[PDB]
UniProtKB/Swiss-Prot annotation, chain A:
Disorder this protein is connected to according to its UniProt record: Xeroderma pigmentosum complementation group E: An autosomal recessive pigmentary skin disorder characterized by solar hypersensitivity of the skin, high predisposition for developing cancers on areas exposed to sunlight and, in some cases, neurological abnormalities. The skin develops marked freckling and other pigmentation abnormalities. XP-E patients show a mild phenotype with minimal or no neurologic features.
Impact upon substituting K11R: Decreased acetylation levels
Tissue note: Ubiquitously expressed; with highest levels in corneal endothelium and lowest levels in brain. Isoform D1 is highly expressed in brain and heart. Isoform D2, isoform D3 and isoform D4 are weakly expressed.
GO MF entry, a single one: protein-containing complex binding
Name listed for the protein in its UniProt record: DNA damage-binding protein 2
N6-acetyllysine PTM sites in chain numbering: K11
Pathway annotation: Protein modification; protein ubiquitination
GO BP term, example: protein autoubiquitination
Family stated for the protein in its record: Belongs to the WD repeat DDB2/WDR76 family.
Effect of L284P: Impairs interaction with DDB1
From Swiss-Prot, chain B:
Record's comment on post-translational modification: Phosphorylated by ABL1. Ubiquitinated by CUL4A. Subsequently degraded by ubiquitin-dependent proteolysis.
Subunit field text: Component of the UV-DDB complex which includes DDB1 and DDB2; the heterodimer dimerizes to give rise to a heterotetramer when bound to damaged DNA. The UV-DDB complex interacts with monoubiquitinated histone H2A and binds to XPC via the DDB2 subunit. Component of numerous DCX (DDB1-CUL4-X-box) E3 ubiquitin-protein ligase complexes which consist of a core of DDB1, CUL4A or CUL4B and RBX1. DDB1 may recruit specific substrate targeting subunits to the DCX complex. (Microbial infection) Interacts with Simian virus 5 protein V.
Main location: cytoplasm
Entry keyword set: Acetylation, Biological rhythms, Cytoplasm, Disease variant, DNA damage, DNA repair, DNA-binding, Host-virus interaction, Intellectual disability, Isopeptide bond, Nucleus, Phosphoprotein, Repeat, Ubl conjugation, Ubl conjugation pathway
The protein's name in its UniProt record: DNA damage-binding protein 1
GO molecular function: cullin family protein binding; damaged DNA binding; DNA binding; protein-containing complex binding; protein-macromolecule adaptor activity; ubiquitin ligase complex scaffold activity; WD40-repeat domain binding
UniProt source species: Homo sapiens (Human)
Modified residues (N-acetylserine): S2
Pathway the protein contributes to: Protein modification; protein ubiquitination
Length: 361, 825
């Protein structure tokens, strides 16, 4: 629809903002087909399990491993990135988000059973909770700043909710088994999402409920769930299973779904579980693929690659692939800016940014 | 450190809405008009329009509907703002005092939801049993019109139909019943539902879903005696009522989309329809009697009455007179005659009302007197298009009709003329190329020069073109600064769009050139892959092509930069020098952009506005001949315009109708932190800014410094609003903020909207209070309240007059302050 004419029409007031968003979605996809040149790579030891972006800065990123080993890395700096090690055997970090206040801090959840807040120089500022008995540990974690709340999930079915200064008035059990992911809305403050191996995903109202499954809404599934992530706008919930499915539930009547995006991301023991994600400034979805000979493929060619779908339609729009990275992209995360992508594969960190330009004298 | 003051120089003139009724009294026929923050109330008279009231609202009016609940002697008014403030208002007049009473008010915002693509829709049941709103997809919001619903509480009903195009309540239903058109994978359909308040749910409608034309676009609910519903499309008109179906397909309507409707006859026998080409039709319903005394539809006919300005909205007024409310051109009052005139038209214009919008571009020129700046805008669009020349003394506006779309303007003093890009629509002829649909400036110029350029016509894989496609013909017009006559018109190649223009001198060359950026436009390309920079010289009454530069993309921007030319081509920024041999030569390039759309410069510094990477602060380095990335605003913002206030302050406007101001990080201790721009000012303006420019329209008070405000940046908007942004000291900022808070404690807000809420920065991503910007309109509103109200406003107010110690402020002190502020525009 040759954008510039539509931009002029929008300057005339003729064309509406969403039409512009649609055209520029098309443009971003068009240039995303030129990310194919893999810019950068970065290794370290045992598998990757959690990923996070420095929100304000584009080129800095944090990542958490299988062995409690955290890394913080900036691009275009060449100053040999920042590292911190851990026990290395049974201390698998599993949740990692920056501090909204002091970007040189980070929260963390560990297989050891200690929800902590800790600096990138090693000093532990505070432990927030603890199991105090092994075979019961934490798996998931997330944070909200507008309300200044922290939330974290277990391997048994109980979720914990803390304030930024302690003051725990929560820790009722919500599910029967492990809670893989859990998340808060950024544009509201007081409805919550949680996902579980019980084949159900539950939407809470953290201020009203106290009665051990006096919840707000419950959405079922056929299989377990590996992730339940909200939108930036707040009105669209994404849900991603373990066998072959993606579901989109809306603000309007959480129960029924709008659309199913079928795509295989099958679970496995030693593999890192897969986590679909939004793109912050469009209505896109980005996912990693894991072929399945039993899935009814529409395409005759089934390769492991990063797929990019549209949210409110159902079908795909782009596919990223690059040899020398024929591993399986467990984690994929875009920037909050919209100009960069990071991928965490087993024992590998990949950067897919846009390629060659012309030159100056 | 950045503290700003924003003020209206000319309020917006475009009409966003218009309705007729009996609102100010039962006997009067009133017309109420909405201009984006302003509500105008007129009485329709035999001679024209009588102004009765003008008010400002703290909000963008999105819905304006009159209604009369049972027991009310005259209509009430329902209004919804863009920030979802809902209110029911009543007009009250006694003597010379006119007041708008708040009968009901409330915030109907949902905590979550995506606002819909087809925008806000609001409808009222004909029996005033409820209000219905389409705000979010998947829901139909119902506000029961009980007198006790003073908080305007509402309930949501699920809609299975997610993409609603239009909806209306039907007549002749025992319960409120909606009929609406929606689109789904099976096609487009029309469906109805009864509305049950007890269940707060839909029940099965009185007639089944029907298929309609694939481009059915509007629904009209027909009053008794007809009943039923009209479905309006692009090529057909249909009527549905139970077992009744009646369709006509008059070819006359196919040429242009019908876009607005208003009921003319109280019994529904006639309606008027206006299209995007200004054609005005009458649609007539022929009656059929029935044995039981009921009336059914016999037939449908369409009758072309004539041509008007491109209508945003229509209202049949009285005495064969219609008001045509336009946003793209001047509004009008027109007369409808039963017999046609000499040219075959039944339409006669009675009155015209100025619309400056859309203001796509402008410049400032000392047209009449040195130091007395006037603004020259490219105004309007298609056959309504014009140039407008605005000066103060409230203001005088000269109009130069173009009858086509102007795009950009520059001034070239040495030739004493202006260059203006323009474009017109043409449609395919019978056997040949294309033919224009009307005369325009580019077809009525004094002289013309077609482009003989063949820079890439050779060695370029041609792209075919099919029949039926209309084409745009772009031109560069050379316009006399004194007479505004079309001195020359240079037409570019077929499918070549001229997009940008600058007049400037470069290097050591004493000639002055017109520089044009272009793009080859084809419908199916996701991005342009070809463009030119073209250097023209004007001499002997004609444009001569001096030089060209071919590029593999659209030349979105060009700017003169320290005797060099900076240009933005698709993903590249390139700096060219003008050589002694009259050629452009690359000095340096910067690549870290997606699309560099807006450019401004100041000294050796460069402000870059990105499509999606909002802004970048660069410095040119002459001793290295290259670019350095100085800093960036790391917050994403979809820009629409930018301006440099000074070396340290950077102005931005964004697509959510807000302004912001960025600064360098004063508290930066590292190069990394130094690289971060800080958004230090935020303001919900409520308008879409297309252009900033340095200049002023006030007579300059030579030796004007040592003043309450610093700097002057004007901006132009789609709605024709003109505004000024200026800087303030810290003390003045604190004073004005205190004053605004106190006024908000004293001023009665229509609909009970808090000023802080209205001016609060608001997007779908984040909500935060405003900072660093004063709303000068609010400040100026102090001067119109009574003196006791002023005294209360300034009661117990500590104030430092001039230079000295602080003391109690009197009303006259603030009158003096605000009067001084008013003279800056």
């Amino acid at each position: 629809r040759s954008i510039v004419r539509t931009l002029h029409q929008h300057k005339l007031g003729r064309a509406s903002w969403p039409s512009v968003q649609q055209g520029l979605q098309q443009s971003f996809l068009h240039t995303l087909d030129s990310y194919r040149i893999l810019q950068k790579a970065a290794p370290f030891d045992r598998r990757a399990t959690s990923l996070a972006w420095h929100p304000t800065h584009p080129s800095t990123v944090a990542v958490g491993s299988k062995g409690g080993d955290i890394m913080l890395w900036n691009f275009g700096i060449k100053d040999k990135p920042t590292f911190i090690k851990g026990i290395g055997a049974g201390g698998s970090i599993t949740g990692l988000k920056f501090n909204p206040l002091n970007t040189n801090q980070f929260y963390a959840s560990s297989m050891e059973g200690t929800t902590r807040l800790q600096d990138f120089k090693g000093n532990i500022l505070r432990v927030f909770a603890s199991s105090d008995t092994i075979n019961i540990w934490f798996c998931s974690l997330d944070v909200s700043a507008s309300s200044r709340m922290v939330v974290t999930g277990d391997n048994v079915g109980n979720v914990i909710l803390l304030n930024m200064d302690g003051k725990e008035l929560w820790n009722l059990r919500m599910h029967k088994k492990k809670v893989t992911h859990v998340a808060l809305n950024p544009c509201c403050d007081w409805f919550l999402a949680t996902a579980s191996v019980d084949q159900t995903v539950k939407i809470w109202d953290l201020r009203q409920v106290r009665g051990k499954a006096s919840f707000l809404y419950s959405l079922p599934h056929r299989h377990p769930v590996n992730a339940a992530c909200f939108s930036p706008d707040g009105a669209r919930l994404l849900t991603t299973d373990q066998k072959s499915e993606i579901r989109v539930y809306s603000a309007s009547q959480w129960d029924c779904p709008l659309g199913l995006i079928p795509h295989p991301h099958r679970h496995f023991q030693h593999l890192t579980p897969i986590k679909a994600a939004w793109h912050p400034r469009y209505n896109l979805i980005v996912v990693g693929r894991y072929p399945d000979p039993n899935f009814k493929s529409c395409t005759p060619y089934e390769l492991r690659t990063i797929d990019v779908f549209d949210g409110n339609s159902g079908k795909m729009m782009c596919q990223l692939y690059d040899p020398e990275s024929s591993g399986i992209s467990s984690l994929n995360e875009f920037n909050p800016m919209g100009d960069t992508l990071a991928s965490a594969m087993g024992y590998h960190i990949l950067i897919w940014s846009q390629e060659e330009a012309r030159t100056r004298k | 450190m950045s503290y700003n003051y924003v003020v209206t120089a000319q309020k917006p003139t475009a009409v966003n809405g218009c309705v007729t009724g009996h609102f100010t009294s039962a006997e009067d026929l009133n017309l109420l008009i909405a201009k984006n923050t302003r509500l105008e109330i007129y009485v329709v008279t035999a001679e024209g329009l009588r102004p009765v009231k003008e008010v400002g609202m703290y909000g963008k009016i999105a819905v304006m509907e009159l209604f009369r609940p049972k027991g009310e002697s005259k209509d009430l008014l329902f209004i919804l703002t863009a920030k979802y403030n809902a209110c029911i208002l009543e007009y009250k007049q006694s003597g010379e005092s006119i007041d708008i009473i708040t009968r009901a008010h409330g915030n109907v915002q949902d905590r979550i939801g995506r606002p819909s693509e087809t925008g806000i829709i609001g409808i009222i049941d004909p029996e005033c049993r409820m209000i219905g709103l389409r705000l979010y997809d998947g829901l139909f919001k119902v506000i029961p019109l009980d007198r006790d619903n003073k908080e305007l509480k509402a309930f949501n009903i699920r809609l299975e139909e997610l993409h609603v195009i239009d909806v209306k309540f039907l007549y002749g239903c025992q319960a409120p019943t909606i009929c609406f058109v929606y689109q789904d994978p099976q096609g487009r359909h029309v469906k109805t539902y009864e509305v049950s308040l007890r269940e707060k749910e839909f029940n099965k409608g009185p007639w089944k879903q029907e298929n309609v034309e694939a481009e059915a676009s509007m629904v009209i609910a027909v009053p008794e005696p007809f009943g039923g519903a009209i479905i309006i499309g692009q090529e057909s008109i249909t009527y549905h009522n139970g077992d009744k179906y009646l369709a006509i397909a008059p070819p006359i309507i196919k040429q242009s989309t019908i876009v607005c409707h208003n009921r003319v006859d109280p019994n529904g026998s006639r309606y008027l329809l206006g299209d995007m080409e200004g054609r005005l039709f009458m649609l007539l319903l022929e009656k059929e009697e029935q044995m039981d005394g009921t009336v059914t539809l016999k037939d449908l006919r369409v009758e072309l009455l004539g041509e008007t300005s491109i209508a945003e909205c229509l209202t049949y007024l009285d005495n064969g007179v219609v008001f045509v409310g336009s946003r793209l051109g001047d509004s009008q009052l027109v007369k409808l005659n039963v017999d046609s005139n000499e040219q075959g038209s039944y339409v006669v214009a009675m009155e015209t009302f100025t619309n400056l919008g859309p203001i796509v571009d402008m410049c400032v020129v000392d047209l009449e007197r040195q130091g007395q700046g006037q603004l020259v805008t490219c105004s309007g669009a298609f056959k309504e298009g014009s140039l407008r020349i605005i000066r103060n003394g409230k203001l005088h506006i000269r109009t130069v009709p173009l009858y086509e779309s102007p795009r950009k303007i520059c001034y070239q003093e040495v030739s004493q003329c202006f260059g203006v890009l323009s474009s017109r629509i043409e449609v395919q002829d019978t056997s040949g190329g294309t033919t224009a649909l009307r005369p325009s400036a580019s077809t009525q110029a004094l002289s013309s020069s077609v482009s003989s350029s063949k820079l890439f016509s050779s060695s370029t894989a041609p792209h075919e073109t099919s029949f039926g496609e209309e084409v745009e013909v772009h031109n560069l017009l050379i316009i006399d600064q004194h007479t505004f006559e079309v001195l020359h018109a240079h037409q570019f190649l077929q499918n070549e769009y001229a997009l940008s223009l600058v007049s400037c001198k470069l290097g050591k060359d004493p000639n002055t050139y017109f520089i044009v950026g272009t793009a080859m436009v084809y419908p199916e390309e996701a991005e342009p892959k070809q463009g030119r920079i073209v250097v023209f010289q004007y001499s002997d009454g004609k444009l001569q092509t001096v030089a060209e530069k071919e590029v593999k993309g659209a030349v979105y921007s060009m700017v003169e930069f320290n005797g060099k030319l900076l240009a933005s081509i698709n993903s590249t920024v390139r700096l060219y020098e003008w050589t002694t041999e009259k050629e452009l030569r690359t000095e340096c390039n910067h690549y870290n952009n997606i699309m560099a759309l807006y450019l401004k410069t100041k000294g050796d510094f460069i402000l870059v506005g990105d499509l999606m990477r909002s802004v970048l602060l660069l410095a040119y380095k002459p001793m290295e001949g290259n670019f350095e990335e100085i800093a960036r605003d790391f917050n994403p913002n979809w820009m629409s315009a930018v301006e440099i206030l000074d070396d340290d302050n950077f102005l931005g406007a964004e697509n959510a109708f807000n302004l912001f101001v960025c600064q360098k990080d004063s508290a930066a201790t590292t190069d990394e932190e130094r690289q971060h721009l800080q958004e230090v000012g935020l303001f919900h303006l409520g308008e879409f800014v297309n252009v900033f420019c340095h200049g002023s329209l006030v007579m300059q008070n030579l030796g004007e410094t040592s003043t309450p405000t610093q700097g002057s940046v004007l901006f132009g908007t789609v709605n024709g609003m003109i505004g000024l942004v200026t800087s303030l000291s810290e003390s003045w900022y604190n004073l004005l903020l205190d004053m605004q808070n106190r006024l908000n404690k004293v001023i009665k807000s229509v609909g009970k909207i808090e000023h802080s809420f209205w001016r609060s920065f608001h997007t779908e991503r984040k909500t935060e209070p405003a900072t660093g910007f004063i709303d000068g309109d609010l400040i100026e509103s102090f001067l119109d309240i009574s003196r006791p109200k002023m005294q209360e406003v300034v009661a117990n107010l500590q104030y430092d007059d001039g230079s000295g110690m602080k003391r109690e402020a009197t009303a006259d002190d603030l009158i003096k302050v605000v009067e001084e502020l008013t003279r800056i525009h």
